[PDB]
Amino acid sequence: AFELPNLPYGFRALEPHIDQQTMEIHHDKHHNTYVTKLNAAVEGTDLESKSIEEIVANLDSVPENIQTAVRNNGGGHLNHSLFWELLCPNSEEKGTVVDKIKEQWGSLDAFKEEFANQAAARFGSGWAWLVVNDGKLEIVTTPNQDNPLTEGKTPILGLDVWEHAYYLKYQNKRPDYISAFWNVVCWEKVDELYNAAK
Amino acid sequence: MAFELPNLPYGFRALEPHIDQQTMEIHHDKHHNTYVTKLNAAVEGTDLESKSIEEIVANLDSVPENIQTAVRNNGGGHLNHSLFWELLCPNSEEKGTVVDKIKEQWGSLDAFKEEFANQAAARFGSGWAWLVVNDGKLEIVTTPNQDNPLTEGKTPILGLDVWEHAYYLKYQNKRPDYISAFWNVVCWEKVDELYNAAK
Ligand SMILES: [Mn+2]
Ligand SMILES: [Mn+2]
């Protein structure tokens, strides 16, 4: 069924913004676990065939006794599958969604300022997102491994703010992590996800 | 006076090699400090400005519903870690009232640890694992984020912070290794003190 996807550029491609140690453990351990437990949950169910997008959209209809496992692990798999593809070494701060973000916030810096505040504000483990919601842009956060897909909002950019993704380098300084993040945001893809959005 | 982040009962390097010295410094001076601050800010000239944190956290729904979320999160923060520092101990000794009463319910300390470890490991995202007194009965629960068993009317006599910030520097992804090490620095002299005062 579900497979851990290969990192597009290896572990050192986001230096010095995200450390090379964190990338290997995040990918090889944290994500790997999500995939193993997810496969264990759906192995032998009607879910086994279907895509993680379809499943995370439909958590409410996932059978009782595996709903938690799928939410947590299905989400972990989707969330991190997007993250890897959304981090770029040759990030160019331009394209469709950036045009569309300047059209909605006035400037990219006024967007970042909100995103950063919502990212910093999410108490405990969670993600910060920019989502396409009924054609409009919205900045929402989720706790743990929850994904706005579950609430009919297509995510086009996400940031893991679990401490396991920033603590080796930035320790308690989550802001520095969010600031740094921008340097490796892969807008070529953030676009790709806006186009396919429904 | 309100609230002030308390000194560790020991040095930062006093729990080595079980909890790293870098983590003991940041965890207390930053993480627990920020809580005290953001908390003090939220209670700036209020009904609970001069109330005990044990009272506030156990009566959380009756906190003005416009600062409720900040107090629950930073209030829990202050109490949880305040407990955690006192419940840690260079020279723990596995005996006393709670150890005898654990033996009485679980059959053995090792059976108790196994459940605590499983429940501690199982807690998804950030939170705490607790041994609490629930109406005289002993019970192992976990709570998300900075929530405390007091809010549900159970007194905590032992707590383990399983936020990734409390173990990632040394143990990284391997939370179970951290839970295992914890047992070497649990302060059963304090666990008793807290149980005794369940009264
Ligand atoms: Mn993660
Ligand atoms: Mn903590």
Q: How would DSSP label each residue in A27-82?
A: IIIIIHHHHHHHHHHHTTSGGGTS-HHHHHTTGGGS-HHHHHHHHHHHHHHHHHHH
- Residue A124 is nearest to which of B30, B125, B173, comparing CB atoms? B125
Long-range interactions of B148-155: CB distance < 8 A, separation 24+: B148/B57, B148/B76, B148/B79, B148/B80, B150/B54, B150/B57, B150/B58, B150/B79, B151/B57, B151/B58, B151/B60, B153/B58, B154/B130, B155/B194, B155/B198
CATH number of the domain that A47 lies in? 1.10.287.990
Decide if B144 is inside a domain: yes
- Residues with a beta carbon under 5 angstroms from ion ligand 2: B 161, 163, 166
Decide if B15 is inside a domain: no
Q: Are residues A65 and A142 in the same domain?
A: no
Say how far apart CA B35 and CA B82 lie, in whole Å. Answer: 11
Q: Are residues A131 and A61 in the same domain?
A: no
Residue A144 CA to ligand 1 centre (angstroms): 9
| Spatial CA neighbour of B77 closest among B15, B157, B191, B165 | B165
Q: Are residues B36 and B121 in the same domain?
A: no
Closest approach of B79 to chain A, Cα-based (Å)? 16
Residue where a domain stops, chosen among A40, A66, A85: A85
Sign of CA dihedral B160, B163, B165, B167: positive
Q: Kind and range of the H or E element at B118? A: helix B109-122
Would you say B149 and B101 are in contact if contact means Cβ atoms under 8 Å apart?
no
Q: Which residues of A touch B (CB under 8 A)?
A: 25, 29-30, 33, 72, 123-126, 143-145, 162-164, 167-168, 171-172
* DSSP secondary structure letter of residue A7: P
Decide if B2 is inside a domain: no
Q: Are residues B170 and B82 in the same domain?
A: no
Give the Å distances, CA to CA, from B78 to A12, A166, B33. Answer: 38, 23, 8
Decide if A123 is inside a domain: yes
Give the Å distances, CA to CA, from B7 to B29, B30, B53. Answer: 9, 13, 17
Q: Are residues B155 and B128 in the same domain?
A: yes
Give the total number of structural domains in chain A: 2
Say how far apart CA A129 and CA A139 lie, in whole Å. Answer: 6
Q: Are residues B111 and B189 in the same domain?
A: yes
Q: Are residues B130 and B189 in the same domain?
A: yes
Q: Are residues A136 and A178 in the same domain?
A: yes
Strands of A154-160's sheet, edge to edge? A136-143, A126-133, A154-160
- Residue A162 is nearest to which of B34, B144, B164, comparing CB atoms? B164
Residue B168 CA to ligand 2 centre (angstroms): 11
Q: Are residues B121 and B77 in the same domain?
A: no
Residues 6+ away with beta carbon under 8 Å from B165: A163, A167, A171, A172, B23, B26, B27, B31
Residue B63 lies in domain: 21-86
Residue where a domain stops, chosen among B29, B61, B86: B86
Resolution to 1 decimal, in Å?
2.8
Q: Are residues B64 and B107 in the same domain?
A: no
Cross-chain residue pair B125–A123, CB shorter than 8 Å: no
Decide if A155 is inside a domain: yes
Residue where a domain stops, chosen among B86, B105, B138: B86
Say how far apart CA A76 and CA A147 lie, in whole Å. Answer: 9
| Spatial CA neighbour of A116 closest among A161, A169, A79 | A161
| Spatial CA neighbour of A104 closest among A139, A129, A128 | A139
Decide if A5 is inside a domain: no
Q: Are residues B39 and B65 in the same domain?
A: yes
Using DSSP, state whether B95 is helix, strand or coil. Answer: coil
Cross-chain residue pair B169–A172, CB shorter than 8 Å: no
User: No. of H helices and E strands in chain A?
Assistant: 9, 3
Strands of B127-134's sheet, edge to edge? B137-144, B127-134, B155-161
Name beta bridge partners: A133: A136
Q: Which tokens belong to B43?
A: 């209670």
Decide if A39 is inside a domain: yes
Would you say A190 and B187 are in contact if contact means Cβ atoms under 8 Å apart?
no
Q: Are residues A78 and A101 in the same domain?
A: no
Residues 6+ away with beta carbon under 8 Å from A167: B164, B165, B168, B169
Decide if B11 is inside a domain: no
| E runs forming strands in B6-151 | 127-134, 137-144
What experiment produced this structure? X-ray
Residues 6+ away with beta carbon under 8 Å from B30: A171, A172
CATH number of the domain that B176 lies in? 3.55.40.20
